[PDB]
Design a protein around this nucleic acid. Structure first.
Lengths: 211, 95, 147, 52, 204
RNA sequence: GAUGUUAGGAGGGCAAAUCCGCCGAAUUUAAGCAUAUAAUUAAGCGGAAGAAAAGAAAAUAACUAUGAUUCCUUUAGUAACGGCGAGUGAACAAGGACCAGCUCAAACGGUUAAUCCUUCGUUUGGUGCAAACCUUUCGACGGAAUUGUCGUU
RNA sequence: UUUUAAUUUAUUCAUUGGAAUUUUUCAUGUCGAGUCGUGUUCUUUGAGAUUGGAGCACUAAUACGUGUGAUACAUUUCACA
RNA sequence: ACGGACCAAGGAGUCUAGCAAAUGUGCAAGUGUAUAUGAUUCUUUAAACAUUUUACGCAUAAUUAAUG
């Protein structure tokens, strides 16, 4: 090395020409999967190819405020919507047995979403114009004239898409309604100082509760 | 830190139950198996040694038995569990 | 871009710009950072002083999401809200802006700068600096702790 | 030997690209520039030519 | 409920009855040939706890595998290399003796069958014993079964040579998930290839 | 158990770019060299598919929590490893592609193995000129199986 | 020309069986053993009083368990599986 | 002192990764739209075009072995 330069650390000391790859076929495969999903959606028969997903908070403390699509609703969410999972997988509803609803807000943010999805169901007959009431909480089925008049409108995909969340960053309050005496920094320091003994207290509380 | 299933969290970011303020929510066959299997098998040699070593019955004996079980099984939890189990069966059989 | 290269302008100079006596040998001083502490020691001491050795404990696995904490100073607090909102806030003394910096993506508020004198501001921040608190309270605002 | 991993393409800023597009559109609207580029337009009336 | 009883007895291996049975069966197995078919499983509870069932296309083979490590295969006793590699005696094979067990039987002796699993059976000072469950992919009894007919299709050929049995998953690190394994999940070589592989976009 | 010039079947070999196991160096770098690096690579042995392998938590997190696997952007040349020298080097979260989940082990049918396979003949209708092929079930016989198949989750 | 979305046609007769959705009780059941784990040796890993694997010795508990929660240990909480 | 008997043709600071400096360009406390996504773009088209109202990279704050 020489002159004033950053000391090299280039991890290139093995046979790397074998590992080098270049993505010449990026837009080509983007097109191929575009036509793949278009063919799937055209062939399935008008049913949307997307599946409904829960709107759920992101983990950790970095992404506490953000929310995103999750892997399937919970059993209690489906029960509150009135659907057994084992029959709700049929209507494009994702379900997982691993998530647990840890808050009433999480429960109630997915229940009405499931109800909104259920409000748009249009069942189809199976036995050559022999429409039936349905099973397992799936909504009712429609007849010849009904299917002939609904099968040709604009499909709704916004509900399938991630729920846009509008949070009012710009908001304000009355000047006289402020708690002028609060000490946020002192509160933070006191909480950090007192963290150990509260853990002690919770430990002893639960030891008592074990009895 | 530590949370609490009751007493919902405070809006403070650092400390005890910190975070948002969201709301929270919440063998007869086996005994027969054990009895017949105990009758058929009995005790392994280290079980017998631990049983007699507890039987001789001193504080140094209890310490030696704990050491022996820990050495023969690995770890401390397994040795403690086996020592307690064998003294329980000693008390039960001394009938 | 080959026609702009320096080698092209010295095509018939025999030595190709690399000297006649010294020549251009392959790795005449070692490969990579070979000569640290031995013969490139002067270069290391002159341009990368604290390179050798080690200091501090070991954080066995970091999990940077735990300590992630974007920061913002007090003098930028009036900058988030738009100009029209700021204008309609400064004129009326009966109304004060409430800013949730965690919405904008900031977690701690430091006190570098100067706040507009006699405009109360309520700030909702995950963490607060002592002098930031002091500036806000002196200007007449109040700090809100959120999580 | 020539290798397939040469920098075949280039990353152009989207702002660069829209600036260039606007500039070329503006240049298409002055008679002298289009005449000098090589189009024989001495007979047409208006250079920002528009048709129904 | 007999199988629970059987499992509970076999869980001891140090009682007088278990010691006697293990001794006599190991003695018989030692004089029996290295690889030989057993008419019925000697541990029905463990066989059925694994994938074994009682359809016609299921057979059981007992195999003897020598214990200890195999030593470096270098000529004489001397390698031409660095001190880091001069070691010859303490070389530990990555394949477990359990996997080598059905590696012996499913390689060429029973090439028309597919290995399903293998279990413990016995032990000796200089041998280890195992029983291996083999499935005939071509017998209509197993082939027609809506269950356990996945082994009939030619994708599960030589699972023990490809490390796809339980022992293979064990020695490949597939028996532990999470941060303890981390690398081994998409297979060790594939993961290493992915991590060493560098991607360059066309437009940079 | 042995045996079948018993009936009906399979394995062997070729081919490897991708893929799955095993075994396994040294050149090189450290301006020497021994740990280290090259490299869990090259060579060697074995094994499949159109993809393979991984895959349904004995997971992650510590949060308002997530929810099989795989791959892409990023984490990140970071935490960390290392004559702490040369050098080596992940994982979580995040944004996306794709997205399907399932069955064996015990309970019970013992007022009925409720199961499975082989062989031999009949028919339920069909697309092919034909050859063949898709469907058809009355069975009967021979067995396997209670040292446990199916039904039941 | 292959299929795949929409689209000509259902009517009856019949008992025969099965399934799935929702109220009253039991029973809180089962849950993978020379296996996990530990010690030691070798190898592997970024994994460091050992990341995984393997060899040898010892060798478990039964869900109130044991397995993780990146520093060995004892006592003990919590979370997840 | 070494190479050169002659002539023709070929013949050697390049490519990629990463960093810095210099200069030009655009925007500017922001900047780059990454993977991906849609579009009657779809010899030319593997490029251009666009991103239903906080992804990340670098910068906007430093310092400490570290609670901070």
């Amino acid at each position: 090395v020489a002159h004033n330069n950053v000391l090299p650390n280039v991890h290139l000391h093995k046979w790397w020409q074998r590992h080098v790859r270049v993505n010449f076929s990026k837009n080509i495969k983007k097109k191929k999967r575009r036509l793949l999903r278009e063919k799937r959606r055209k062939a399935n028969g008008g049913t949307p190819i997307e599946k409904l997903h829960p709107i759920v908070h992101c983990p950790t403390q970095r992404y506490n405020f953000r929310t995103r699509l999750g892997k399937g609703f919970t059993f209690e969410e489906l029960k509150g919507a009135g659907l057994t999972p084992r029959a709700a997988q049929t209507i494009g509803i994702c379900y997982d047995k691993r998530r647990k609803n840890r808050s009433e807000e999480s429960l109630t943010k997915n229940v009405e979403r499931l109800l909104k999805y259920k409000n748009s169901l249009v069942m189809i007959p199976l036995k050559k114009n022999k429409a039936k009431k349905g099973i397992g909480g799936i909504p009712a089925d429609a007849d010849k004239n009904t299917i002939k008049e609904f099968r040709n409108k604009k499909p709704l995909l916004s509900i399938f898409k991630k729920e846009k969340n509008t949070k009012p960053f710009y908001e304000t309050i009355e000047v006289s309604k402020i708690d002028k005496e609060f000490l946020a920094y002192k509160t933070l320091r006191r909480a950090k100082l007192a963290e150990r003994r509260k853990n002690r207290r919770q430990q002893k509380k639960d030891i008592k509760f074990k009895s | 830190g530590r949370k609490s299933t009751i007493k919902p969290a405070t809006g403070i970011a650092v400390g005890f139950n910190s975070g948002h303020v969201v709301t929270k929510r919440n063998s007869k066959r086996k005994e027969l198996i054990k009895d017949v299997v105990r009758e058929i098998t009995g005790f392994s040699p280290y079980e017998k040694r631990i049983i007699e070593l507890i039987k001789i019955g001193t504080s140094a004996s209890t310490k030696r038995s704990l050491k022996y079980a820990k050495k023969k099984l690995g770890t401390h939890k397994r040795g403690k569990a086996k020592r307690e189990e064998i003294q329980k069966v000693v008390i039960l059989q001394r009938r | 871009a080959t026609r702009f290269k320096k080698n092209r302008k010295k095509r018939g100079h025999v030595s190709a710009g690399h000297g006649r006596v010294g020549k251009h040998r392959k790795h005449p001083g070692g490969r990579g950072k070979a000569g640290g502490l031995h013969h490139m020691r002067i270069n290391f001491d002159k341009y990368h002083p604290g390179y050798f050795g080690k200091v501090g404990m070991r954080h066995l696995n970091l999990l940077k999401n735990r300590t992630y904490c974007p920061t913002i100073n007090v003098d930028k607090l009036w900058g988030l809200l738009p100009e029209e909102k700021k204008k309609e806030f400064s004129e009326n003394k009966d109304i004060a802006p409430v800013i949730d910096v965690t919405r904008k993506g900031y977690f701690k508020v430091l006190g570098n700068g100067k706040l507009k004198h006699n405009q109360p501001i309520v700030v909702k921040a995950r963490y607060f600096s002592s002098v930031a608190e002091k500036k806000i309270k002196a200007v007449g605002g109040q700090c809100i702790l959120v999580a | 030997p020539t290798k397939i991993w040469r920098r075949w393409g280039r990353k152009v800023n989207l702002k660069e690209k829209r600036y260039a597009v606007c500039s070329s559109i503006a240049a298409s609207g002055v008679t002298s520039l289009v005449l000098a580029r090589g189009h024989r337009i001495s007979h047409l009336k208006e250079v920002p030519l528009v048709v129904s | 409920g007999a199988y629970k009883y059987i499992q509970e007895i076999w869980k001891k291996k140090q009682s007088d009855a278990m010691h006697f049975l293990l001794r006599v069966r190991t003695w018989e197995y030692r004089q029996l040939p290295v690889v030989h078919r057993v008419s019925k499983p000697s541990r029905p509870d463990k066989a059925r706890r694994l994938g074994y069932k009682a359809i016609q296309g299921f057979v059981i083979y007992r195999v003897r595998v020598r214990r200890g490590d195999r030593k470096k295969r270098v000529k004489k006793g001397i390698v031409h290399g660095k001190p880091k590699h001069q070691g010859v005696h303490k070389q530990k094979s990555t394949r477990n003796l359990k996997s080598v067990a059905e590696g012996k039987v499913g390689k060429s002796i029973c090439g028309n069958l597919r290995v399903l699993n293998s279990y413990w059976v016995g032990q000796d000072a200089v041998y280890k014993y195992y029983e291996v469950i083999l499935v005939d992919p071509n017998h209509n009894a197993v082939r027609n079964n809506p269950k356990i007919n996945w082994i009939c299709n030619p994708v599960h050929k030589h699972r023990e040579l490809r490390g796809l049995t339980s022992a293979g998953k064990k020695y490949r690190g597939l028996r532990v998930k999470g941060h303890l394994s981390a690398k081994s999940r998409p297979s060790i070589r594939a993961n290493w290839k992915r991590r060493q592989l560098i991607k360059l976009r066309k437009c940079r």
